[model samples]
Target: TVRKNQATLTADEKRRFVAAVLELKRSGRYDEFVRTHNEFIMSDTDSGERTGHRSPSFLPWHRRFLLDFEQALQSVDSSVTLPYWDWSADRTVRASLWAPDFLGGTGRSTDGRVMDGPFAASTGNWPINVRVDSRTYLRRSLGGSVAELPTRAEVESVLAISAYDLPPYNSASEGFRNHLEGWRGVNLHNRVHVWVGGQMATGVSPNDPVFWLHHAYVDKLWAEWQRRHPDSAYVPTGGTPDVVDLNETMKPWNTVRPADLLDHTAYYTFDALEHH
Candidate 1:
């Protein structure tokens, strides 16, 4: 079976996985993924006519975005699947996920160039196609922007939120979705971006391979939220104008609706998830 969990991936699995991503890049499909992410990042905002990100649709918007990315990877190579990063468990470079054969570890203080891992800048294998900065290749200095990663306890705090999402979903809600989205409140998503520093903080963040890993962990948190409050689920069910209701279809992929993505198990499953 395909490796669904990051912790369970073997060396051969990782090698085949990295090769698949590289092949996508070689075939020019990887850049399209970058383009797609950027388009949604810019368009899914609360400013003016756009309300995808700021409204209740924020959860489903990103849900669809990540699905599109994973589907692209699946299209390239069926064996290549999205692997999640549990930042709470692998907060430091010591985690096996950063091993030379895998995604690699943190970078040096002076420059963000990763010194180890499968996609190290020195390898010339994984070139960063889309970045906010002028330079290429993945770069990251762990703890360079922030002193530390969020601990499991901290992640649990977010998972405990009982509400699916608060009303007036414009980024100020009390649920984990809005909090992780980082548009309002303590700012989870963008703060992590800022914490990564370099190109990651900017719009062209896919430059850092860690971006995917970080988002993987964020996505895991969403799963955790679902477990904590089983009754709590995707909201904005009715004719809530300007909001992408739970069943409403999102743009770009106009055919599939948010309702199609409510259950992640239908698409992918995690290795080990904490319900409460």
Candidate 2:
């Protein structure tokens, strides 16, 4: 599967992608993804047995998660693949990425409810069924909670670091993983979530369709990092407590391991990433 940047998706690709996502939501499969994410995000503490976030396994765990989502999307529409948001380039409320036909624009002044797009609550297709709060509507305050999204220069800086992750591999780590994860440094990943605001800033971010694109872009960066630092591999290699070691199976899918998910091409490819 070749995942293109969201900006590059043609009219047909956009329509098909949106249709497939809405179908998934209707089929009752989409809400479970949100629930699983919420569970992991809530339980994966920095000081605890973290598997999804705030640790060395962050990249691989998310990689696997995105693959699962993409596979589910493909089940609805065989031609569709998850797209990358490329927030560094398409970074504005005015961008077409938020157009009514696309993911829609920001929320209104009265509330953060998205007024357009297929995922809009008004559409009666996408609903915030799995949530920590009471609101059941999809929302986004684009460029509100955070003034700006990270730039290419900021992204390059995180990518330049050679170490995949350092000691104390949680959010406290001083290396590429934490930097890209946005717990430290220029804030590549987390800042974008804040930029979008709404449920994206919450544990159940998958409620918003843009979540797939955002994470797909993040996965692209990991592939690019591998090329930049061919020698730099995932750390906490074999035996690490509270972290999914390279060979240890990740939860929610006990059969897969970080080592199995490292080579992204084994599942899919990115348009922005170099191919073999």
Candidate 3:
């Protein structure tokens, strides 16, 4: 799978992506992903144990998770791979990524319910099945919760960090992992979640299709980091308690490990990768 920037997807590519994502929702496969992510988000903690989020494994774990989702999408339509949203570049509601043909625009003020796009509840194609609230409709307040997305300059500053992750590696760790995870530093991934607002800001964020795109870009950043700092790598290489070591296995999937996912080329490549 070759993940392209959302802004560059052709009309037919956009159509296929929409069709496959909706197919997953209709076949009862989509909501389960939301459920799984929520489960990990609720469990993974900075004080006790961590795996999926807020740890050094945050990058690798999401990389595998996105791979699983992309594989599922390929099963639906082999031509449809997950496309990433370069929020830094296309940082507005007017971007084509939010157009009706694509993922649709931001929600209205009254209820934050997305009234336009294919996933709109009015379309009856997308539903907020696994959710915190009773309302069963897609919602998003794009650029509502947060004033702006991370700019390229901010991302560059993060990429300039040398260490993969620091000790007591959790949200508080002043390393690349926490910075990219948005628990600290300038805030990258988590801020995007907050910026999208609505269901996206919640634990069951996979409820919004944009969640995948958001993570794809984060995953892309990990790849970019690898290129920029070829010598730097994931930390906790061995014998670390409550934290997943680089070689240790991750949760929900015992077969793969962080070491296995570091190189994305074995799985997929980005549409355009610039080496520093």
Candidate 4:
């Protein structure tokens, strides 16, 4: 299967993707994913044991997470696959990714509640069930919290890093993982979260459908890194306290390890990957 850019998806493709995601939400299968992600985000620490975020496992963990979600989508609509949002290119609120036919546009000023699009509370489709706040509705304030999204140049700089991760691996680590994770370097992933605003700026960000698209692009960058630095690989190979070793199993799915997720081609292909 090939995952294409959201901007390039056909009208029918967009339709199927939306229907599948809404089905997952209606079946009560989506909120658990939001809850699970919030648990890991709240638990992930810079100094202690980390599995989902702020560590080398961040890449592989999200890779598996996206895979799980994509599988769920496929179950509902076999022809649909997760599409990525290359924010560097589609960096404006007016991008097709935010079109009403897709994930929808920014929230209104009154309460930051999305007033148009399919997921709008008025649509009676999307709801904010797995959330931290009291108001239960799809909300977003595009470009409200963060000023700008990462440019292609910034992403290229992060991709240039050779090492997968370094010692004392955490948010402080000066390696590809931390930089790409947006806790250290030019702020790639987290900045996008902040740019989306609203619930996306919170731990329950998965509540927003765009969350998957954002992470899909991030995961693509990891695959790009692997190709750029063919010799470089996941670090902390041996016994490393509080950090996930290269081959060790990750949480929530004891059977799957970071090692199992290193190869993206083993699961799916991107519509376009540089130098592939």
The residue-by-residue lDDT of candidate 3 on 1-276, one tens digit each, is: 689999999999999999999999999999899999999999999898899998999999999999999999999999988999999899989999999999989999999999998999999999899988888999899989899999999999998899999988998899888999998989999999999998999999999999999999999999999999999999989999989998899899988899999999999988899866
TM-score, structure 3 vs. true: 0.99
How many steric overlaps does candidate 4 have?
Answer: 0
Model 1: CA > 4 A from native = 1-3, 49-52, 183-187, 274-276
Task: Report residue 52 deviation for candidate 4 (angstroms).
Answer: 0.3
- TM-score for candidate 4, residues paired by index: 0.98
TM-score per model over all chains:
0.87, 0.98, 0.99, 0.98
Higher-lDDT candidate of 2 and 3: 3
Clashing pairs in 4: none
Candidate number that wins on TM-score, 2 or 3? 3
Which whole-number lDDT from 0 to 100 does residue 125 have in model 3?
97
Write model 1 residue lDDT over 55-119, tens digit each, in one string.
66666666666677677777877777777766666666677877777877777767777778767
Clashing pairs in 3: none
- The TM-score-based order of candidates, best leading, equals 3, 4, 2, 1
Off by over 4 Å in 3: none
RMSD of 3: 0.7
